[PDB]
Structure formats: structure tokens, C-alpha cells
Amino acid sequence: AVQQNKPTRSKRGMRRSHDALTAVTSLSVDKTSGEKHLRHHITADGYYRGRKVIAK
Amino acid sequence: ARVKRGVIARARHKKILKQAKGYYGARSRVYRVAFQAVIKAGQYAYRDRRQRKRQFRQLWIARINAAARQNGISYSKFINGLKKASVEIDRKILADIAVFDKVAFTALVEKAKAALA
Amino acid sequence: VTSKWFNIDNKIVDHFP
Amino acid sequence: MKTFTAKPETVKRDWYVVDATGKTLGRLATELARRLRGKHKAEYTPHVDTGDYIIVLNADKVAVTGNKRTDKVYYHHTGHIGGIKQATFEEMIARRPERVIEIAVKGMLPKGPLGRAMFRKLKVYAGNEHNHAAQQPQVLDI
Amino acid sequence: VTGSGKKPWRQKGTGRARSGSIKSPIWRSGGVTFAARPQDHSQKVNKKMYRGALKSILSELVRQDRLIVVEKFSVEAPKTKLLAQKLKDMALEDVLIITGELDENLFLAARNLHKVDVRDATGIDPVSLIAFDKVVMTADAVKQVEEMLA
Amino acid sequence: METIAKHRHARSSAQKVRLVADLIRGKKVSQALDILTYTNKKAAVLVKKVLESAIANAEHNDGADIDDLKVTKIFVDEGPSMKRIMPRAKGRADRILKRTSHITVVVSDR
RNA sequence: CCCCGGCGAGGGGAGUGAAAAAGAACCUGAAACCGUGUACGUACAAGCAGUGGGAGCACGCUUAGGCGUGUGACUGCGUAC
RNA sequence: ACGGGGCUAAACCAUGCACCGAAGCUGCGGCAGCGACGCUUAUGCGUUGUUGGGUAGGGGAGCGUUCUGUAAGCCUGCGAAGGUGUGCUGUGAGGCAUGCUGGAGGUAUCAGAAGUGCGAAUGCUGACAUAAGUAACGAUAAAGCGGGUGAAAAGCCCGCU
Ligand SMILES: N[C@@H](Cc1c[nH]c2ccccc12)C(=O)O
Ligand SMILES: [K+]
Ligand SMILES: [K+]
Ligand SMILES: [K+]
Ligand SMILES: [K+]
Ligand SMILES: [K+]
Ligand SMILES: [K+]
Ligand SMILES: [K+]
Ligand SMILES: [K+]
Ligand SMILES: [K+]
Ligand SMILES: [Mg+2]
Ligand SMILES: [Mg+2]
Ligand SMILES: [Mg+2]
Ligand SMILES: [Mg+2]
Ligand SMILES: [Mg+2]
Ligand SMILES: [Mg+2]
Ligand SMILES: [Mg+2]
Ligand SMILES: [Mg+2]
Ligand SMILES: [Mg+2]
Ligand SMILES: [Mg+2]
Ligand SMILES: [Mg+2]
Ligand SMILES: [Mg+2]
Ligand SMILES: [Mg+2]
Ligand SMILES: [Mg+2]
Ligand SMILES: [Mg+2]
Ligand SMILES: [Mg+2]
Ligand SMILES: [Mg+2]
Ligand SMILES: [Mg+2]
Ligand SMILES: [Mg+2]
Ligand SMILES: [Mg+2]
Ligand SMILES: [Mg+2]
Ligand SMILES: [Mg+2]
Ligand SMILES: [Mg+2]
Ligand SMILES: [Mg+2]
Ligand SMILES: [Mg+2]
Ligand SMILES: [Mg+2]
Numbered sequence: 001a002v003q004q005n006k007p008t009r010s011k012r013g014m015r016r017s018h019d020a021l022t023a024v025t026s027l028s029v030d031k032t033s034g035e036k037h038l039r040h041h042i043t044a045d046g047y048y049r050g051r052k053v054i055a056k
Numbered sequence: 057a058r059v060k061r062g063v064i065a066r067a068r069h070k071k072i073l074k075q076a077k078g079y080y081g082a083r084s085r086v087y088r089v090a091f092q093a094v095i096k097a098g099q100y101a102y103r104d105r106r107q108r109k110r111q112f113r114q115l116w117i118a119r120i121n122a123a124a125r126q127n128g129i130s131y132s133k134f135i136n137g138l139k140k141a142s143v144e145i146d147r148k149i150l151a152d153i154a155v156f157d158k159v160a161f162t163a164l165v166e167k168a169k170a171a172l173a
Numbered sequence: 174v175t176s177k178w179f180n181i182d183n184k185i186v187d188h189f190p
Numbered sequence: 191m192k193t194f195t196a197k198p199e200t201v202k203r204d205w206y207v208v209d210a211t212g213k214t215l216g217r218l219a220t221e222l223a224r225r226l227r228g229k230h231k232a233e234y235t236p237h238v239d240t241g242d243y244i245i246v247l248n249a250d251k252v253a254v255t256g257n258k259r260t261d262k263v264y265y266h267h268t269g270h271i272g273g274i275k276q277a278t279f280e281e282m283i284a285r286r287p288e289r290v291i292e293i294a295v296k297g298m299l300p301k302g303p304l305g306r307a308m309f310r311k312l313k314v315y316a317g318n319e320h321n322h323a324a325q326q327p328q329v330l331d332i
Numbered sequence: 333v334t335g336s337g338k339k340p341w342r343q344k345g346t347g348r349a350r351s352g353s354i355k356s357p358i359w360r361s362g363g364v365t366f367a368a369r370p371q372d373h374s375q376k377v378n379k380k381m382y383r384g385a386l387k388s389i390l391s392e393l394v395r396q397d398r399l400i401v402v403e404k405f406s407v408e409a410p411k412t413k414l415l416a417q418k419l420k421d422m423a424l425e426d427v428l429i430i431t432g433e434l435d436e437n438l439f440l441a442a443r444n445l446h447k448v449d450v451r452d453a454t455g456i457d458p459v460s461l462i463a464f465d466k467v468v469m470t471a472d473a474v475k476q477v478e479e480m481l482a
Numbered sequence: 483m484e485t486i487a488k489h490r491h492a493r494s495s496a497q498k499v500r501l502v503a504d505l506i507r508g509k510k511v512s513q514a515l516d517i518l519t520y521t522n523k524k525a526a527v528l529v530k531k532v533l534e535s536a537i538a539n540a541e542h543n544d545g546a547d548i549d550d551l552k553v554t555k556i557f558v559d560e561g562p563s564m565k566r567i568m569p570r571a572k573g574r575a576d577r578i579l580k581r582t583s584h585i586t587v588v589v590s591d592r
Numbered sequence: 593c594c595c596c597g598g599c600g601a602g603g604g605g606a607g608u609g610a611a612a613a614a615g616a617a618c619c620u621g622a623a624a625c626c627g628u629g630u631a632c633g634u635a636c637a638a639g640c641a642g643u644g645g646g647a648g649c650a651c652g653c654u655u656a657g658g659c660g661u662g663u664g665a666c667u668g669c670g671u672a673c
Numbered sequence: 674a675c676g677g678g679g680c681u682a683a684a685c686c687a688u689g690c691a692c693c694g695a696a697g698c699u700g701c702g703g704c705a706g707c708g709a710c711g712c713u714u715a716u717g718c719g720u721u722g723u724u725g726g727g728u729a730g731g732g733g734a735g736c737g738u739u740c741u742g743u744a745a746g747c748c749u750g751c752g753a754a755g756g757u758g759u760g761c762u763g764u765g766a767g768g769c770a771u772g773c774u775g776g777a778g779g780u781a782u783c784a785g786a787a788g789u790g791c792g793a794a795u796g797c798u799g800a801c802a803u804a805a806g807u808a809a810c811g812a813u814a815a816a817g818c819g820g821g822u823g824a825a826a827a828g829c830c831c832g833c834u
Contacts, residue, residue, distance in 0.1 A: 485604075486603085486604070487596080487602090487603060487604070488602070488603055488604090489601085489602055489603070490601095490602060490603075491601080491602075491617095492601095492602085493601095496626075496627080500627085507628095531596085531597065531602090532596095532602090532603085534596065534597085535595090535596045535597070535602090535603070535604080536596090536603090536604085537596085538595065538596040538597090538604085539595075539596075539603085539604045539605080540604095541595090542594080542595045542596080542604080542605075543594095543595075543604055543605045543606095544604090544605090555628075555629085556628085557627065557628050558627075558628095559626075559627065559628095560625085560626050560627080562617080585602095586628095
């Protein structure tokens with residue numbers, strides 16, 4: 001099926017009121033390294049909750 | 057002599073789009089839709105210059121009817137009594153007195169009840 | 174072109190004789 | 191000079207209380223609608239609500255003439271198909287005494303967001319007592 | 333217009349407006365609808381109407397004193413410097429000189445001056461008389477034009 | 483002080499990139515940089531490079547300080563399109579538009 | 593020439609020029625179309641979306657006053673070409 | 674199967690007097706057409722009477738566009754045409770003045786000639802929307818991991834399954 005009238009630029013923007021992205025509320029700070037990371041994720045060099053889990 | 061329609065067409069399109077300011081949607085953006093909107097708005101303005109003289113009289117009647125009934129007389133009997141007393145005050149003025157000078161609108165009602173008597 | 178085979182198919186097109 | 195227009199933020203509204211015992215249903219509802227709308231004031235403006243607040247007491251003792259007591263029927267539709275429901279005047283006074291007066295006054299007011307604002311100034315009670323003693327309602331033999 | 337007489341698409345079924353040629357004036361690069369041909373714009377004026385309008389022009393120049401009559405007008409050498417000085421003495425800026433016979437030297441002197449025209453009584457035309465601000469006719473030229481208009 | 487960085491002819495449509503730019507409008511560049519690092523969108527990589535570059539124009543050219551810069555003004559504009567052809571069934575063909583963008587970031591220390 | 597970037601694309605400065613919003617996609621640079629900012633309206637309200645009436649608000653102007661501009665709650669009438 | 678609320682009259686019959694009610698008629702201001710008659714026109718004015726809904730259609734009078742003469746004139750780098758606002762003005766088509774952009778042309782008056790005016794033709798060409806960040810991403814033979822390079826590796830190279 002296809003439209004009978006051209007939907008306006010307000011109906012288009014109302015449909016997109018639910019299309020926004022949500023920012024990450026906070027980043028946890030590592031216990032020893034002191035660097036931010038996603039919560040429950042290892043940091044960018046392999047520290048997770050103090051210990052170094054990936055010595056790479 | 058070849059004549060190009062460019063400068064002149066733009067002036068005449070921009071005239072109609074200038075009168076269509078405040079209209080929702082394509083009626084203030086698109087010439088085709090805005091031309092019909094400006095024409096239909098000129099028919100309403102002509103028709104409503106006649107109704108402005110009716111809507112306002114209808115309002116003046118209804119404020120005299122309400123102020124007169126506070127003095128114990130209806131509109132139809134109050135207007136008759138002023139013709140019998142040869143008072144030629146306007147309905148636009150009578151409805152004005154009813155709001156701003158309630159002691160002068162009273163004095164008019166005694167004048168009308170007397171002649172109606 | 175012209176088709177839109179269902180605008181050529183004459184069972185679909187020639188439905189009201 | 192232009193005609194005076196009442197301003198929504200400076201209109202004076204007052205509280206009245208009406209007893210509805212033995213009044214005729216429709217011949218009372220027209221006086222309610224007249225004052226709910228403001229037609230009794232020299233400041234009446236069509237697009238402003240200049241009316242008064244009205245309390246109606248004893249709503250279950252209102253009266254109808256003729257055989258309307260058992261023959262007046264109130265229909266409404268629920269939206270679902272086949273949902274046409276009716277009640278007589280007898281049955282609504284039994285169940286919803288206040289609804290009978292409010293239906294009558296509501297059909298006599300203007301339709302639209304201003305006529306719905308007039309209807310909010312009508313307080314209707316089935317009994318004889320009301321909680322608005324703080325508003326100091328005056329008595330109306332209307 | 334250069335092109336083909338092929339029909340761009342068939343008459344029915346396409347969903348497009350009927351077209352029959354790529355050279356029609358509706359289309360871009362098509363013909364002109366009422367295209368021009370070379371034309372002759374010359375009109376006819378009766379001999380009497382032409383001569384009757386020179387008499388009005390001439391008798392009107394006299395009324396507004398733009399007709400100046402002399403008996404000799406000539407320069408001794410074909411030099412634009414000489415004719416320029418001669419015209420300054422008579423206080424003339426732009427002028428049409430009408431002479432009985434075309435002087436060999438007065439012609440060559442006057443053609444670098446854009447506000448000066450030297451002409452023979454046989455070749456005066458209506459637009460020249462109205463155009464220039466002053467007209468100078470030698471005496472032998474006045475009698476030549478009087479007979480020509482009769 | 484106001485500082486600009488642009489990315490003209492970015493290769494993604496404006497509607498997709500506007501989702502990302504609306505996250506960092508009005509934030510400080512410190513918060514903005516770490517928000518952009520943890521959104522899994524292609525447009526966040528593009529926008530982050532324009533932001534890190536505006537920050538750099540502020541010290542070298544304007545002599546500002548990172549600790550108090552804010553993303554005062556960010557927007558995306560529709561750019562030119564590259565038009566292609568997508569062959570469809572039964573002999574028909576379509577028109578693909580590969581849409582681009584212009585990303586502008588403005589950082590101000592005030 | 594310097595700076596961010598991938599020894600990128602793109603940009604910010606510096607410089608040339610009368611002009612660089614004349615920067616090679618380069619005179620002028622309209623409209624549709626798409627955005628960012630500010631003022632006002634809008635989440636109990638039914639329809640060719642205007643027109644007549646009209647409060648409130650915002651910004652100007654000048655006063656011993658209400659005028660201009662923007663918006664338009666509520667309201668009569670109104671079924672495009 | 675009163676337009677509705679409602680109505681025992683807010684129904685019907687008879688009489689009467691008020692009022693409401695139209696772009697009808699009157700009041701006040703203005704414009705134009707046609708007659709009659711005159712300060713005497715000079716083609717106009719004054720008094721007066723009257724008319725002024727309009728399709729097909731007939732009659733009259735104009736605006737603006739490009740080009741030719743007037744014009745080797747006049748305006749213009751102290752800012753032309755074009756673009757974009759604002760104000761004033763005419764019964765209309767329109768005109769005029771000016772802020773900003775623009776950076777070299779424009780053209781009075783009065784005559785002349787027309788490729789002289791666009792919303793429609795399933796009109797023609799170019800740009801750009803809508804549906805919509807939706808369907809789809811082309812055989813249901815199938816991948817998993819380690820190392821390398823690299824700004825970045827599910828897909829590239831190397832190795833084992
Ligand atoms: N419907 C089938 C067969 C078909 C092809 N061309 C047609 C024309 C008319 C009717 C049917 C057809 C298809 O599209 O492959
Ligand atoms: K050919
Ligand atoms: K020469
Ligand atoms: K420029
Ligand atoms: K524009
Ligand atoms: K309205
Ligand atoms: K200009
Ligand atoms: K068209
Ligand atoms: K889309
Ligand atoms: K697949
Ligand atoms: Mg079709
Ligand atoms: Mg051609
Ligand atoms: Mg001959
Ligand atoms: Mg396919
Ligand atoms: Mg094929
Ligand atoms: Mg420079
Ligand atoms: Mg140039
Ligand atoms: Mg340009
Ligand atoms: Mg609300
Ligand atoms: Mg409700
Ligand atoms: Mg009725
Ligand atoms: Mg009357
Ligand atoms: Mg009237
Ligand atoms: Mg009339
Ligand atoms: Mg007529
Ligand atoms: Mg010319
Ligand atoms: Mg011009
Ligand atoms: Mg034409
Ligand atoms: Mg038409
Ligand atoms: Mg194009
Ligand atoms: Mg499309
Ligand atoms: Mg869908
Ligand atoms: Mg789906
Ligand atoms: Mg899918
Ligand atoms: Mg595949
Ligand atoms: Mg791997």
C-alpha cells in the first residue's frame with residue numbers, strides 16, 4: 001500500500017522523537033590504574049578491578 | 057526581440073508569498089498553495105466586513121438586555137419606551153453606559169418606564 | 174514496460190464483460 | 191473608541207446555592223445555564239467566562255410533569271457495537287441523582303473548551319448539605 | 333529542427349503524457365512555434381503626403397528660427413580644422429549643411445565632425461531636418477528645393 | 483573566544499550524524515570526549531575527530547585552555563550527493579543517492 | 593611556513609590580493625528543500641487550517657498615552673483550485 | 674420521524690401590541706458610467722437625475738517586459754544591473770525612496786516593433802522532497818581460534834582444526 005497524501009515535516013519529526021540516543025551515565029574508574037572504563041568491562045590495557053587480567 | 061520572463065515572474069511570485077506570512081505549512085512556502093490561500097483569505101475579509109457590523113450589534117443588544125433586567129425591565133420594553141420618549145441614543149452608546157456609568161443607565165430606565173407608563 | 178504484467182494479464186484486466 | 195471587553199483575569203465571580211426541591215427539571219436548568227455563562231451581567235463577553243459558581247442541593251427531588259417520570263429515556267452508546275444502553279428517569283434518580291440535572295444543564299451550554307469550563311462551576315449534590323461553607327454561598331430563589 | 337520523426341514512446345500504456353515528436357515546441361530543444369522569417373518592413377507613402385510633410389517641416393523650422401540662409405558656404409582647403417573654425421564663428425555646434433552642388437572639399441572637411449552633416453538639396457529627408465539643431469541652406473539651394481516641392 | 487573546526491564532505495548522511503551531535507551540545511570538552519568514546523556509532527568517530535581538532539585550534543591559534551572549553555555550537559549540514567544506479571528486476575533501474583555531510587564544531591572558553 | 597589528522601580527506605592560522613563568504617566544487621549566487629539559535633504558543637483537545645473579535649507575554653518608542661512589531665489562549669463564521 | 678437540551682406550554686386556535694432579523698431601505702464619506710441643462714466650454718468644469726451582480730460574448734481604457742530612435746545626451750567605482758529587507762504611495766496591473774549584498778553597467782520623455790505576462794496541458798528539462806533510515810544486502814556449502822601487518826582486522830597474509 002502507498003500513501004495518499006504527502007506526510008508533513010511535523011509528522012516526520014514527531015515520529016523521530018523516540019529516535020534519540022542515550023549517553024552512558026557514568027564511567028567507572030579503575031582501582032589501581034585510575035583510568036575510566038565501562039562498568040563491568042576491563043580497561044583499555046587489561047586491568048579489571050585492580051588486578052591485571054590481560055598482560056598484553 | 058526575445059523577452060525573458062525571469063525578473064518579472066519572480067517579483068510577482070514574491071508578492072503573493074509576502075501576504076501569506078503566518079500560514080501553516082506549504083501555505084506560506086509554496087506559491088501554488090499560497091496563491092489559493094491569499095485569495096480565500098480575501099474572500100473572508102470581504103465577507104467578514106459585513107459580519108463585523110452584525111456581531112457587534114448582537115453584543116450591544118445583549119448587554120442592554122442584561123443591564124435593563126437589573127432594573128426590572130426587559131430589552132424589548134426598554135427600547136420601546138425610549139422611542140416613546142423620543143430618545144435617540146445609539147445601541148453602541150447605550151451598551152457603553154451600561155458598563156461605565158451605571159447611575160446614568162439607571163436614569164435612562166426611569167425615563168423609559170415613565171413614557172411606557 | 175507497459176507492464177506490470179498484471180496490466181497485461183487479461184483475466185485480471187478484462188474482468189467485466 | 192472600541193467596545194469594552196471583559197478580561198479573564200479581573201472578572202468577579204460569586205457563589206450561590208440553589209434548592210431544587212419541587213422545581214421543574216428544565217425550567218430550573220435554563221436559569222442555571224444563564225448564570226453559569228454570565229448573561230445576567232452587563233460585562234458579558236462571548237469569549238470570556240463571566241459566570242458565577244452555583245451549588246444545587248436536593249438534586250434527587252427535582253420534578254417532571256406529565257408521564258415523564260417513567261417515560262423519559264436516556265440513551266447512550268458505549269462504543270462497542272450493539273452497545274446502545276438506556277435508562278428511564280425513574281432509574282437514574284435511583285442510581286445517579288446528580289447526573290440527571292447535569293445532563294440537562296450540559297446540553298444547554300455552549301460547546302467547546304469554554305462551554306466545558308462553564309460546566310465546571312456547577313456543583314450538584316443529592317443531599318441537603320455541602321462542603322463549601324468556606325466560600326460563603328448566597329441563596330438564590332431561581 | 334534537426335532530429336528524427338520517430339515517436340518517442342508508444343501512444344498508450346506508458347503512463348506518460350502523449351508525445352509524438354522530439355521537435356515540438358513544448359519540449360526543450362524543440363522548434364519555435366511561430367518562428368520568424370526574413371521580412372520587409374518598408375511602408376508606402378504617397379508622393380503628395382511625402383512632399384506635404386517636407387513643407388510642414390520647412391515652414392516650421394522658419395517659425396522656430398532654426399533655418400539659416402546664406403549665399404556662399406565653402407572652405408578653401410579640405411581640412412577639418414578650417415570647417416571647425418568657420419562653424420564656431422557662426423556659433424553653430426551641430427548643423428546640417430544643404431548646398432546646391434556638393435563641394436569636393438566641404439564634403440571631406442565635414443565627415444570627421446560627428447555633429448556636422450553636409451548634404452545636397454536633392455538628398456534632404458524628413459528625419460535629417462528634424463534631427464539636427466540648426467539647418468544652413470545656401471541661397472542657390474533654397475531655390476533648388478522650392479521647385480522640387482513645387 | 484570562538485573556534486571552529488569543520489569536516490566538509492563527510493561520508494554519511496546528516497540524519498545519522500545528527501543523532502550523535504545531539505549528545506554533546508552544551509557539554510564541556512572533557513565530558514564530550516568520553517561520551518564520544520563509548521557510543522558505538524560510526525558518526526561518533528567522525529565527530530570526535532572534528533572535536534579534537536577544534537580543541538587543538540584553540541591553543542595553537544587562539545591560545546586557550548582545555549580545562550574550561552565548552553562545546554558551544556555544533557551542527558551538521560547536508561552536503562552534495564553522488565548519484566548512482568541500482569539495477570532492479572525486470573529491466574528497471576533505480577537511483578542511489580550517497581549522501582554526505584558537513585560537520586561543524588565550535589568551542590568557546592566562555 | 594606552522595597546528596589537529598592516518599607521512600590522509602578535511603579544516604584552523606599565516607601569507608598573496610582591492611576582495612579568499614574571489615581557493616580552484618572558484619563572478620553574481622534566487623526558490624524549493626534541510627538545519628542551529630532566540631521570542632511567543634502548544635500535552636482534556638475534533639474538521640480546507642483562514643477570517644472578524646481578542647486577553648496575556650516578549651522587545652522597542654515615548655510618556656505625566658498607548659502606539660509599533662512578533663506570537664495567538666478563547667470565540668462567531670467558514671466543505672481547496 | 675422537534676436540529677439538540679428540554680417543554681404540559683416553551684403545543685394548537687383567535688385577537689393585540691412590542692422587539693429581533695438581510696450585502697433590502699435610510700444616514701454619513703468616497704469613486705465611476707450615462708443623460709438633461711448650464712458658469713461656457715475645448716473637450717473641460719458646474720448643477721442635476723439616474724445607473725453601477727455577472728458566464729459565453731461584444732465595446733472602451735491602461736500597466737509592465739525586451740529591443741530601435743531622441744542619446745557621442747543623462748545617471749553611475751562618492752557604487753550600475755541583479756539579489757534581499759523596510760517605508761511611503763495609486764482604483765488595479767504597479768510606482769517611488771532607501772538599509773545590506775553586488776562590483777559595471779543602466780537609461781528619462783515621447784514615438785516604433787513584438788519570441789511581450791503562466792498554476793494547470795497524465796506539459797518539457799534540471800534540482801530537491803515523501804514513503805524512510807523503512808524493504809533489501811543475490812542460493813540455507815559453514816565456520817572456530819592463535820600469530821602478523823596496520824590509524825584501525827569477522828572478511829587480507831601465515832598456521833592448526
Ligand atoms: N507473472 C509471471 C509471468 C509473466 C511474464 N510476463 C507476463 C505478462 C503477462 C502475464 C504474465 C506474465 C512473471 O512475472 O514472471
Ligand atoms: K538526425
Ligand atoms: K572616419
Ligand atoms: K564578493
Ligand atoms: K537561500
Ligand atoms: K477562529
Ligand atoms: K542595489
Ligand atoms: K506542471
Ligand atoms: K529518509
Ligand atoms: K542471505
Ligand atoms: Mg495511470
Ligand atoms: Mg533551438
Ligand atoms: Mg517613388
Ligand atoms: Mg532485486
Ligand atoms: Mg536482464
Ligand atoms: Mg590576508
Ligand atoms: Mg568582473
Ligand atoms: Mg559564487
Ligand atoms: Mg491544555
Ligand atoms: Mg473531559
Ligand atoms: Mg429548531
Ligand atoms: Mg426594530
Ligand atoms: Mg445590516
Ligand atoms: Mg444598497
Ligand atoms: Mg458589471
Ligand atoms: Mg534605447
Ligand atoms: Mg533594467
Ligand atoms: Mg511567450
Ligand atoms: Mg489556468
Ligand atoms: Mg539538475
Ligand atoms: Mg523519489
Ligand atoms: Mg512503515
Ligand atoms: Mg519491519
Ligand atoms: Mg530485513
Ligand atoms: Mg552474498
Ligand atoms: Mg583473527
